[PDB]
Design a binder for this molecule. Structure first.
Ligand SMILES: NC(=O)c1ccc[n+]([C@@H]2O[C@H](COP(=O)([O-])OP(=O)(O)OC[C@H]3O[C@@H](n4cnc5c(N)ncnc54)[C@H](O)[C@@H]3O)[C@@H](O)[C@H]2O)c1
Ligand SMILES: NC(=O)c1ccc[n+]([C@@H]2O[C@H](COP(=O)([O-])OP(=O)(O)OC[C@H]3O[C@@H](n4cnc5c(N)ncnc54)[C@H](O)[C@@H]3O)[C@@H](O)[C@H]2O)c1
Ligand SMILES: NC(=O)c1ccc[n+]([C@@H]2O[C@H](COP(=O)([O-])OP(=O)(O)OC[C@H]3O[C@@H](n4cnc5c(N)ncnc54)[C@H](O)[C@@H]3O)[C@@H](O)[C@H]2O)c1
Ligand SMILES: NC(=O)c1ccc[n+]([C@@H]2O[C@H](COP(=O)([O-])OP(=O)(O)OC[C@H]3O[C@@H](n4cnc5c(N)ncnc54)[C@H](O)[C@@H]3O)[C@@H](O)[C@H]2O)c1
Lengths: 324, 310, 271, 268
């Protein structure tokens, strides 16, 4: 623990200026309550939740008997649904996603950032349980109707649905038709997601850069007026570092990319190490662990105290809350 | 009043108490403060374009023709000289504010709602442009979907010409999405709008595409001089609107619009604290609504009960 | 003027070259004593409320009547108002004689159909999705808004507000054919007003085309008064080359047939 | 296959048969497959070398970072070649197509039509739609290099495909009209090709029986899987498989091309 903390401190000390600025911005958004987390399949896989390539390859085994491009990801489930029946599709869905898995530490770190909302394409309930444990209530929206009757100000928006109503394929977006008619089938959910993106600070965690949903979001963001939105933060946790060409392309596309592999060296299959590196960097920056010089000490104290310069006297009891 | 009107009042007041009431204020409320109606601008454009002096499509066409012909400078100058006039804030603006709306969406370019919010001591983050959406300093929005003249009395800051309406979804994606989200997640009351209004019917067309029971029917405060024909009410209520008719609300003249608006506004406000229970069944229903959640607890302190009943 | 004669010369060259298609509207059908649309709108309004129309009302009133009274009443009114033997007015004969490549008509009557049949000029009539795929002829008489060939019902026609709302979804093949014919031929807009809903929709579509990637359609404005200069320039920059019958000749308000006949026969002679 | 060849022969005799020539036919003429040029782009970006997304993205990434000049330079060095027209070109033209629609941006089909004596008003840009001087059309729906080997004249990157309708309204309208008014036979197209699937997505919007189901000539080595065949025939494509039509070698594609084309021609 102490060794890991010291190594994280050294990593922060040798961190690049752009990455430290990104960390500062994310921490400021968290302090302001305007931080939204967009969780992908990486966080779900961190809890060994069934991966989608597995589902697609069982579908392909049923279709052709021998067990995958990105287009295939949507075509194969569609071919199974059409050639086969919806009953077999739903049976596979239930047999595979009808499992109970723990909430890996990345869920805890995501919830510990105090995100205003947690958007996710994951049909699992890991994030819901994680927010239940922490005692903060998130109104879960996974169907069109759920949008209207939202109980709380904080949203847990599963943009692709989930299996709360049942392990049926009409509850989730998995096949090609679901994606083609998503705008027509999920008007309210899509509008809510876009509004949350526009009004909040979005951090993409668990997504590959070439993911379908990320590219769709960037396509939509292209339409927005220049400088009318804040560039979302993209936590990239792929094994190998990010190529400079891809990094520049996707940063010009509208992302501020924090590459986990570029901060901490780890084994090719040590995804949890990279997720933890990024999330722990953010959390410790939140937890004042990385402030060492007296200059940063004065800056932190001033940031906490200066607003109180407007008041004539501050109760000593209040000073406790002033310093959390 | 009629049972359906009382039900609309109850729903509106419950939403206002819960903080989930959004007010969609049209041009009628602004005109209530003598603000120049758009038809005045359209007639001025027609008089400048032709010898002298409008359909719904002409509303957008004549400004568009004047633009294309006489220049953005001329269009802008007409708008500036016609709109750069200070006006007072109506008692109906203050009634709307006193309803405690979560958000106030409006298709008005004036600051009358802005001035009323500033006077009433209500802090709303004003969203009149695309950049304002991300810069919203508060969680309650005063959303001018058609822009305004805060940046300047320019024709590019507001949606007046036909081209502006044609490319609205492309020029105001953030604002349009925000309006649709607020409509979906809130209780919407339309005031100052004609039932055949362009914006109202565009919103109804959008709602047509939603799921059958995935949204709450917006409340439409209709304040035209004559009572709504039963055929029109049937047509528009089947389209997702719950209409509170002011003409049916009270007897009034043909051109006393302030009284018609104030009837509905006051009837809503005074019902804010009204239990709306007269028979014993309603009283017992209200008491059960107050006391049933406490059935989970084994015992309730009597001194606590005062908070249960406010 | 140079403009009028040059436009008519262009029309005649299109006719001679064989790339001429006529977009026939409501005025041409109204000439031969055919109920104007606002007459049916007034009929629906009277049935709805008992007393008597903007562009939006044109669609909404039939839509309101269909929604409340029902589809059966809508179809009954349509039948009793449109089932009638009517004569092919001289403008039909003139347009046919101009040897159009195709006839694209927003009118749901059979007038142009009967004119073609009895005049010897054969067109494959396309008024429904099934027509486009299986049409014997290569030259189409395209009724974009359908007609009553199958039956006097509102489902075969585009009248209500919802019919115009879902036209692209409901008439993909017909709309594609119309736009292709507009792109690949010379369009003469006869029987339409400048502020027409259909004309403005077509101009909206044209606005999205590549700059000077098409030939501006010819708009025959057979209206009572002369066209205002500002309106004329506005609609000429919208991709329309307008030939006005209120400036070509002089007549009174009700001489609509005279305006049509003049603006058509003069072009015919110029060829 | 008998009914499909009967229908194709009927269309050819009547004159209402159109051919959709894909990249496969030009590849037959040793014209580089698209994935080869995608690998070329991927080599100058990351240094060392394919789904549809990457197909459209690698060119897009190179265009964005490297610039327009490098994109056009690679295009010029990659397409400044002359390739003989296959016997497949001649066989396809032997049916006297009403129109020929191809996504290939080469000039193989133009030269084949010239040599065989047929005349098609080749359309490859927007301004060519109005100026066409014939009812016969050769619709190059993805542009051409006739105006020069410039990136903006063709549709081969992600941005081009995304804004195709907004940039090719007339060409898209003409293609859809030709498909609706004719019977279409697809030749040299991947059964899972992006353009073919976009066409199928558009077709699923049309009302049932309002269009002739297009013929898809599949020339892959292995026979089309029964599940894939059933799915893509339900979608609206009548699939004729050359792999199952006659046994063939894996890398000998011309044999299946000729098998299908000559089985259609001899069926005349
Ligand atoms: N062709 C295919 O797409 C395919 C098919 C079957 C299996 N696989 C294998 O599955 C493995 C992982 O899933 P994927 O293929 O969808 O990755 P992916 O590259 O498609 O998804 C990448 C994103 O998901 C996260 N992620 C990926 N793998 C993870 C893992 N094992 N644990 C935790 N987070 C992970 C990463 O954070 C990354 O941002 C890969 O090694 C892949 O080779 C791939
Ligand atoms: N061409 C024109 O439309 C035109 C031009 C000049 C005058 N007028 C007449 O003057 C009045 C202008 O209003 P409109 O026709 O645009 O209404 P409208 O029907 O277009 O607007 C409807 C809404 O505006 C409100 N409203 C209407 N008139 C109002 C007024 N004078 N003061 C405050 N609120 C009002 C109503 O509450 C109603 O909900 C109308 O009575 C109209 O007949 C119309
Ligand atoms: N539409 C209405 O609500 C309304 C109200 C009063 C009068 N009118 C009548 O409408 C006619 C023209 O006005 P509009 O353009 O608004 O009508 P409209 O909506 O019928 O326009 C049809 C177009 O066709 C041509 N046309 C018009 N009347 C014709 C006729 N009798 N025969 C042949 N062609 C004709 C003109 O180009 C006209 O613009 C006049 O006869 C007028 O008496 C209509
Ligand atoms: N996940 C993936 O997508 C994946 C993975 C590994 C390999 N591959 C593919 O293996 C491919 C081998 O070729 P392919 O069959 O997939 O081609 P293809 O996918 O480009 O199919 C193109 C079409 O053109 C025709 N064609 C293909 N090759 C031809 C040739 N040499 N000559 C004439 N016509 C030809 C084919 O019959 C097919 O109709 C590579 O292009 C590569 O993309 C794909």
């Amino acid at each position: 623990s102490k060794r890991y903390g010291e190594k994280l401190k050294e990593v922060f000390l040798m961190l690049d200026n752009n990455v430290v600025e990104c960390i500062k911005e994310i921490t400021e958004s968290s302090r302001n309550g305007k931080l939204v987390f967009f969780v992908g399949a990486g966080v779900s896989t961190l809890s060994d939740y069934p991966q989608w390539w597995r589902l697609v390859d069982k579908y392909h085994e049923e279709l052709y008997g021998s067990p995958y491009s990105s287009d295939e990801y949507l075509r194969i489930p569609q071919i199974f649904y059409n050639v086969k029946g919806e009953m077999a599709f739903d049976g596979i869905l239930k047999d595979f996603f009808q499992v109970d898995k723990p909430t890996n530490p990345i869920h805890d770190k995501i919830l510990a950032m105090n995100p205003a909302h947690v958007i996710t394409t994951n049909y699992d309930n890991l994030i819901d349980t994680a927010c239940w444990k922490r005692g903060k209530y998130f109104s879960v929206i996974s169907a069109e109707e759920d949008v209207a009757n939202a109980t709380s100000s904080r949203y847990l928006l599963k943009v692709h649905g989930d299996f709360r109503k049942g392990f049926k394929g009409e509850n989730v977006v998995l096949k090609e038709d679901d994606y083609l008619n998503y705008d027509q089938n999920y008007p309210l959910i899509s509008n809510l997601m876009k509004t949350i993106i526009a009004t909040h600070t979005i951090v993409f965690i668990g997504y590959g850069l070439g993911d379908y949903n990320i590219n769709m979001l960037l396509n939509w963001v292209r339409k927005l007026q220049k400088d009318s939105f804040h560039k979302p933060f993209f936590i990239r946790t792929d094994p190998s570092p990010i190529e400079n060409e891809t990094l520049i392309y996707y940063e010009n596309k509208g992302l501020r990319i924090i590459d986990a592999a570029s901060l901490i060296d780890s084994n090719e299959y040590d995804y949890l190490e990279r997720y933890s590196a990024v999330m722990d960097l953010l959390i410790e920056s939140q937890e004042n662990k990385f402030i060492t010089k007296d200059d940063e000490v004065i800056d932190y104290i001033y940031g906490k105290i200066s607003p109180l310069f407007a008041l004539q006297y501050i109760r000593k009891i209040d000073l406790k809350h002033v310093f959390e």
